[PDB]
From a paper:
Here we report a third nitrile biosynthesis strategy featuring the cyanobacterial nitrile synthase AetD. During the biosynthesis of the eagle-killing neurotoxin, aetokthonotoxin, AetD transforms the 2-aminopropionate portion of 5,7-dibromo-l-tryptophan to a nitrile. Employing a combination of structural, biochemical and biophysical techniques, we characterized AetD as a non-haem diiron enzyme that belongs to the emerging haem-oxygenase-like dimetal oxidase superfamily. AetD seems to be dimeric; each AetD protomer has a 7-helical-bundle architecture, which comprises three core helices that house residues responsible for coordinating the diiron cofactor, and four auxiliary helices.
We obtained a snapshot of AetD with a single iron bound (Fe1) by expressing the protein in minimal media with Fe(II) supplementation, and then co-crystallizing the purified AetD with the substrate without any additional Fe(II). This substrate-bound structure with a partially reconstituted cofactor was determined to 2.3 Å resolution, with two protomers in the asymmetric unit. One protomer (chain A) has a single iron bound at high occupancy in the Fe1 site based on an iron anomalous difference map. First, for chain A, the single iron (Fe1) is coordinated by H79, H172, E176 and the substrate; D76 is positioned similarly to the substrate-only structure, but now makes a hydrogen bond with a water molecule that is also coordinated to Fe1, attaining an overall octahedral geometry. Core helix α3 is more ordered compared with the pre-cofactor assembly state (that is, substrate-bound-only state); there are two additional helical turns in the segment D170 to T177; T177 to I186 is now ordered as a non-helical loop; and the Fe-bridging ligand, E176, and the Fe2 binding ligand, H179, are ordered adjacent to the Fe2 binding site. The density is improved for the Fe2 ligand E140, and, together with D76 and E176, these three residues form the Fe2 binding site. Chain B of the partially reconstituted active site structure harbours two iron ions. When we set the B-factors of these iron ions in chain B to be the same as Fe1 in chain A—the iron ion with the lowest B-factor—and refine the occupancies, we find that Fe1 in chain B has a similarly high occupancy to Fe1 in chain A (~84%) with the same ligands and coordination geometry, and that Fe2 has approximately half of the occupancy of Fe1 (~43%). Fe2 attains a square pyramidal geometry, coordinated by E176, D76, E140 and a water molecule (w2). The only missing ligand is H179, which is in the disordered segment (T177 to I186) of core α3.
Numbering used by the authors:
A (entry chain A): 0 to 238
B (entry chain B): 0 to 177, 184 to 238
Write the structure that this text describes.
């Protein structure tokens, strides 16, 4: 039942939206610089997410049409890592450090789940047919939209106050994620018309469970990082 | 029993040993500082190799005996990333930079195969039985031993000249690499399907290692002046 899979995604989304980290990020009584304290944590993810789209999801030598739809989808998501680096500099988090200090930060044990999220997604997606890969992408995009709907609230506050163009923790990022390329069909529209077998349904349920459990593990690391570095607020500069 | 697989590993090793990068690293007529120009490239691998042993290979919740032998083997290999960071500082490569520059370096397109080698190994090993995981580990350890037999030649030269204790590009690292996995493979009978999969494993591991070494060669050519800068005691 693909109707049950897409509703399972909504059920997982509704539970995921209630995590304490998002209540903190959406709280406008706290300065947006303190709500974006978790921003450096995304460095263990953002470029690994670029590689996930470049090299794991994508298969340019494929003739299958559903794979080509996945390929078109990766072309958009593989651009967002430069947006992350754009806002990293604007937030005053692109700090100078020793090369090994940058390595120890990315591979910190406190960012374990953040760093291996795309890795675990790639392992889960490797032996899947294209329509089952779409379930992974749809669940992953659903969790990501919950995150960036929240992060865009302090990001757009800093962007208007400092008069700087933010690209990652911004509404334009959310709107691009919500939409899709002109001329291509929606992955969700393809899923709504797809009939799954009993074996596919069991694998699809496992996919949704794992994607949101791993996203929840990541968000837990964001919370603990904010608690452990509560003074390391963002330091943007006005234009 | 599995003699063809262990011989295939030996054939791939002998072919792998002849790559031009290793001839460059073993040439003592070139200063060891110039032969270790490729050392920063390992930043895209060494810590990913730590995670590979910690989280992909290792399975502490397993009762299988072959998996426990893998778990013990990962406890040694998961320590070597700190050795890499040690020799990184000694060689004068632990330089100061912006956070994004370090990110752009690791995820450089010129280090693609270096960066995703452990990732591709993990993807290959995930659905394998423990004895088949051992085939992956054995081929990977054989290629790594060819790498560090070579790098230890200029590394020990700098270690002797500067009287500093190197840990990664050093003989002590090679000696640790050299309950055995190899003994289990010799006593294991594979099915026809298992043997065919083991051939695929060996081909992929050494092909991916060859791509990594190819990136090391192009990096040395592109940064021929950025020789190591170690200091004497
Ligand atoms: N829109 C995100 C993609 C994304 C998708 N899912 C995500 C999760 Br779960 C956590 C984080 Br942090 C990021 C994502 C990006 O462009 O990097
Ligand atoms: N002895 C290496 C492990 C290793 C095993 N295989 C390797 C290959 Br192929 C390339 C490189 Br660079 C390193 C390895 C280490 O501890 O980092
Ligand atoms: Fe995005
Ligand atoms: Fe090692
Ligand atoms: Fe080893």
């Amino acid at each position: 039942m693909m109707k049950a899979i897409l509703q399972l995604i909504l059920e997982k989304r509704q539970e995921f939206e209630k995590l304490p980290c998002f209540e903190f990020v959406r709280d406008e009584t706290i300065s947006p610089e303190e709500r974006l304290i978790l921003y450096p944590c995304i460095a263990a993810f953002a470029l690994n997410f670029r590689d996930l789209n470049r090299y794991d999801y994508r298969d340019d030598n494929s003739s299958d049409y559903y794979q080509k739809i996945i390929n078109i989808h990766t072309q958009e998501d593989a651009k967002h890592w430069e947006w992350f680096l754009n806002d990293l500099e604007l937030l005053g988090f692109d700090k100078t450090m020793r090369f090994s200090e940058a390595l120890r930060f990315v591979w910190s044990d406190d960012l374990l789940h953040t760093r291996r999220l795309c890795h675990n997604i790639a392992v889960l997606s490797h032996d899947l047919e294209p329509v089952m890969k779409m379930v992974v992408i749809e669940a992953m995009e659903t969790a990501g939209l919950v995150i960036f709907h929240a992060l865009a609230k302090p990001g757009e506050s800093i962007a208007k106050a400092t008069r700087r163009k933010y690209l990652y923790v911004a509404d334009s990022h959310v709107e691009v994620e919500t939409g899709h390329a002109v001329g291509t069909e929606n992955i969700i529209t393809i899923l709504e018309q797809t009939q799954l077998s009993s074996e596919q349904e069991e694998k699809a349920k496992e996919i949704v469970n794992k994607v949101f459990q791993w996203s929840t593990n990541l968000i837990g690391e964001f919370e603990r990082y904010v608690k452990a570095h509560r003074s390391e607020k963002a330091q943007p500069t006005a234009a």
